[PDB]
Amino acid sequence: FEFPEELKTKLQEHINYFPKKRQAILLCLHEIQNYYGYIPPESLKPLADMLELPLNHVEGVVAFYDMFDREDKAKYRIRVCVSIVCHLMGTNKLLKALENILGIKPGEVTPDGKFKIVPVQCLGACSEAPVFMVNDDEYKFESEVQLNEILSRYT
Amino acid sequence: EFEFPEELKTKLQEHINYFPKKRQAILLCLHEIQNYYGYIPPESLKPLADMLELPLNHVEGVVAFYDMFDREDKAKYRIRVCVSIVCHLMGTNKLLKALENILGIKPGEVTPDGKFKIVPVQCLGACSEAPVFMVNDDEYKFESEVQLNEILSRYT
Amino acid sequence: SYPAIPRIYAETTLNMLLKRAKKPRVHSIDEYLKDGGYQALEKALNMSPEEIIDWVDKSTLRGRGGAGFPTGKKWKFAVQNPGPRYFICNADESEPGTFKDRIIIERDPHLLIEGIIISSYAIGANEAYIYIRGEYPAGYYILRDAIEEAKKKGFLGKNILGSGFDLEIYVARGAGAYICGEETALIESLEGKRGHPRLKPPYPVQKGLWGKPTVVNNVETIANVPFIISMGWEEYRYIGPSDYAGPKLFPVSGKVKKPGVYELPMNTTLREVIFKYAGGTLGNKKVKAVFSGALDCFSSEELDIPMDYSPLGFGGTGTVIVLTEEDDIVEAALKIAEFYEHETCGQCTPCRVGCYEQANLLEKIYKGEATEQDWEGFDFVNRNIQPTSICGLGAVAGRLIRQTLEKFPEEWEKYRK
Amino acid sequence: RSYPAIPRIYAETTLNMLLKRAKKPRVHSIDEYLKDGGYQALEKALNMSPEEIIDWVDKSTLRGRGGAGFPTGKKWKFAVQNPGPRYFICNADESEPGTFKDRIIIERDPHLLIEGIIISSYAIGANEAYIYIRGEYPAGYYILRDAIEEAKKKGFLGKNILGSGFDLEIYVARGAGAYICGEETALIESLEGKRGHPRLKPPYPVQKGLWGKPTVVNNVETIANVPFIISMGWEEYRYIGPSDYAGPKLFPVSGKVKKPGVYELPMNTTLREVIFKYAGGTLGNKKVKAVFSGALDCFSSEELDIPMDYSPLGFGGTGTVIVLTEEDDIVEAALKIAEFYEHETCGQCTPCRVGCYEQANLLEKIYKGEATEQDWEGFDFVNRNIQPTSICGLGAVAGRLIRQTLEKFPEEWEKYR
């Protein structure tokens, strides 16, 4: 396995950004996940070499940090907050609306690999509960009609 | 000399700062003045002109033009009675009669206590609810004298 | 807390403009957002202004303020002129029998606001106005509060939703003049002056507020804009007849069982408005006439016309004041004359003297104190209000009354004897 | 410059300091920051000795806004007694439930934070500084990267800043989903490219931090105060609020209030005032049952009259106000707090590892009505025994709020027994 040159260039920028290469590990893993829609297991050995770190170190880090997903490829990650404020204000309504539109529940991917619902802890937008993200974009859920229109923006 | 009380002057300054140009606030200011005093005091116009950076005769002409402003009669509550086509068809005269029975005044007149003035006005844009009147900013369908009496009892 | 407003009945077959405003209460931004509100704006900001103009043009949207001028075409005229440009929402609604615009303002203010934002973007205006008549104080407080809600949610201010588009909406109040709904008098009032109409041309789109390109559009017109963007122009054009497409509001008053505002397609006939929707006449009396505000008088022989902007259509504001068989047409004509007497701005001599004399003499006729000369004078004056007039008031101050003279000669004759 | 979508959190200020710009929900770039007099505090700072800056920050009575309220000046003094090089770290990991105060500074007024970081770095003699921002704030990350570049171009970062001989680079690191990485020592481990495992304290970072060197870690909101202290002087700063607990404070208010959002207020404000005077009262005007101070404390409705300060009887914490009303099931809410700690224990310490897990696992059984008598007794035991041997604050408090609900709402718990 080998990184495409456009991605490798991007990883090199991160590695060169901080004073020490190993500081770039999380920026690198975000970049990888952005590129592939998940963390390819085969990507870690080459990344470890670029960071001048042992492979097991890199594996331990991927395992520790909940945002990284080595299991499921998805184009769009719908992160749904399931913490206290969103729960009080209507996480379950958002989840039901998502099941109506997409036919999936938290932890599942659509068969086309387009959407995965990820249950997450407080997203720091609790005044706008219930909160969800679609990749980097963040939104307040208002209603199913509203949600349907938002999701239609992601092709 | 006449000066605006600070509570009024403050509100006038908000309006004047609201639009991009000071002079655009002229009607909002005059509404505010009439709200405070129960009419437009003639003496108020020169200070307002100064605040708007307009000539006095400009302000005077604007007050004269706009029918909502009243330089003659102080009144705590203006009972605006619609006298246009739909309200006329549906019972303006019944409403005027009820008002005369309760308050003892006709259109154009003020009660002796200065509390109520009846103001005949053109179509108020609530014609489905004819006959229509306002009491200051509140607006109502007239149903009957007993009902009108209850409405007016809320203005003290 | 807002001033008391009468609870005007509202009914819709289309569920668009009156989707929320059929319920007589303020719908605030959260309720608006629950119904998908402001998603049309988000869509619009991802389109070019030129595209938005194109969609509004192809929709067939015509001016709902009464003249029916094609809206997209108005916008195109504006944008061919150098900026800055201004966008004005005309909420002066003061035509007799007309209460269609206030129910949007007072019940679903965000529909209007969303429309203003999209329209302003379309024509490149960074400053917009609502001019609301002074006798709508509640509408004013509701709009001010709604605009602050829109600011809170980032739909107004600088760099709206990262688009680079900036907009402020200012709310101005009228203070008693019908003429300030005439678009050029409205502009004079926004500039801090008396409401005196300007000679046209130029039209506002060439020379308006502070002499810059300015679009004036009616409340109802603007309320259509979110639907055009949300549905697309083709889907919008499926509503009603393809040549006069979209929802229309019809304020119905007078001698009907169910007076109120009806949202209906424009292929609806006048007879259907009265009998199918507004519940027929009070006491099931016969229709004598319908006043289209203070503009036209239709007789009972003219009820099968479409409520559209065609030459043979009802046109105007869609305002339907129903008179029945026992209503005296001369008494009704007097009220129309009194209206115009009260509202001429006086700049033009035949309008000034003609509106006054028409009312003065018709009162004499009505009271049976008219001389033969007063009769002949009334006829002459009625025919001579229009010459030299620089705005539509003088053009039409004799129109409805003349139509009653032609359509109800027997009633008038009773007065001439 | 296009950024990911951010919901438009409402923000309101009585003091016009931290939220002078951030009360408007958009990015304020360097030109707007400069127009408001920004970066003049830095210039003034660079004409001062580090020693004097520390003195001012000490005399301001500024306390850590990350939640513990440690005196900031004292923290800095401790660092500078140790030989360099030294490092400065801005903690932007903000992941406590209910807590969204820091992001509005980052996303709307980044230069306020940047200016604070430069002054603070100069004060402690750090030439290398970091912002560690949680991974779930991607917009904040890009906004900060862009602002740093703006600052560089205007000569506020780099070598020999404004001819002072002071050098600074600010690096922006991202988290990747671990609440624990907000704990200052786990944050440092993460910056060093490792798992976010907290270290035994003491030593505190000011003695031994990043690469073993003296390191000051301060919260976003703490740092954002620094430009004001320099701009106005410490005397003037102390005139804000009560003289013991001086300065502006941000209060993120969520849950069952009419106006959820961030409020900038002085710390003599009561909790009752926050909810009722500022946040508009409760949804549906329902009675307040409890306030959760993030995931740390539970206040009952008998404890609303407390000051929002760092006093022993005060609200304390981060200022986070999650409101629950009379219908909200306290056991259901406790389960959500238990689930949070279950998901975030790093697992180094055995009672924390097993305790956070079992607390959640058993409370779910209790909630679902499937708990045995031994499950109930086990729950009580585990809740009281998460803390022993813990080396960071998570283990120390993972049972705290839940225990408070057990003591303050026994009626409701007993119903589940």
Ligand SMILES: CC(=O)C1=CN([C@@H]2O[C@H](COP(=O)(O)OP(=O)(O)OC[C@H]3O[C@@H](n4cnc5c(N)ncnc54)[C@H](O)[C@@H]3O)[C@@H](O)[C@H]2O)C=CC1
């Ligand atoms: C709703 C309400 O309370 C009232 C409504 N009206 C209505 O006002 C209408 C007359 O309005 P106006 O005199 O503005 O009509 P118009 O036909 O001269 O112009 C209509 C619109 O199209 C524009 N327009 C017309 N010709 C144009 C041209 N050549 N180029 C650019 N714009 C043009 C013009 O600027 C205006 O906005 C009547 O039909 C009434 O129904 C009158 C009084 C009160």
Ligand SMILES: CC(=O)C1=CN([C@@H]2O[C@H](COP(=O)(O)OP(=O)(O)OC[C@H]3O[C@@H](n4cnc5c(N)ncnc54)[C@H](O)[C@@H]3O)[C@@H](O)[C@H]2O)C=CC1
């Ligand atoms: C904002 C947010 O998302 C979260 C905030 N928190 C808050 O974190 C707080 C606990 O933090 P910590 O365990 O760091 O508190 P502490 O009291 O041990 O120390 C606070 C600061 O003072 C320094 N400090 C304390 N004693 C010191 C000493 N003797 N010498 C030097 N520095 C000292 C210490 O290094 C840290 O920076 C709680 O009150 C929570 O409110 C927790 C989780 C998430």
Ligand SMILES: Cc1cc2c(cc1C)N(C[C@H](O)[C@H](O)[C@H](O)COP(=O)(O)O)c1[nH]c(=O)[nH]c(=O)c1N2
């Ligand atoms: C005397 C008089 C009074 C008014 C008008 C005309 C005249 C002659 N017009 C029509 C106005 O000038 C203009 O045509 C419309 O506002 C344009 O908007 P639309 O193209 O209809 O959307 C008008 N329009 C409106 O929207 N509200 C109003 O209250 C009035 N009042």
Ligand SMILES: Cc1cc2c(cc1C)N(C[C@H](O)[C@H](O)[C@H](O)COP(=O)(O)O)c1[nH]c(=O)[nH]c(=O)c1N2
């Ligand atoms: C589990 C856990 C999690 C966090 C913290 C603590 C603990 C125990 N702390 C507090 C942090 O360790 C430290 O006290 C502050 O960052 C110090 O800065 P101030 O003195 O508040 O300016 C903390 N602080 C902060 O600024 N942001 C955060 O996201 C967190 N998260």
Ligand code: SF4
């Ligand atoms: S036609 Fe009549 S209302 Fe219009 S400008 Fe002339 S005088 Fe004024």
Ligand code: SF4
């Ligand atoms: S107390 Fe808990 S979170 Fe803190 S270091 Fe120990 S196991 Fe990790």
Ligand code: FES
């Ligand atoms: S609890 Fe969902 S964003 Fe905070």
Ligand code: FES
């Ligand atoms: S005629 Fe009276 S409100 Fe219209």
Ligand code: NA
């Ligand atoms: Na270094």
Ligand code: NA
């Ligand atoms: Na979950």
Ligand code: NA
């Ligand atoms: Na301007």
Ligand code: NA
């Ligand atoms: Na009215």
Ligand code: NA
């Ligand atoms: Na209404």
Ligand code: NA
């Ligand atoms: Na604005």
Ligand code: NA
């Ligand atoms: Na009038």
Ligand code: NA
């Ligand atoms: Na300023």
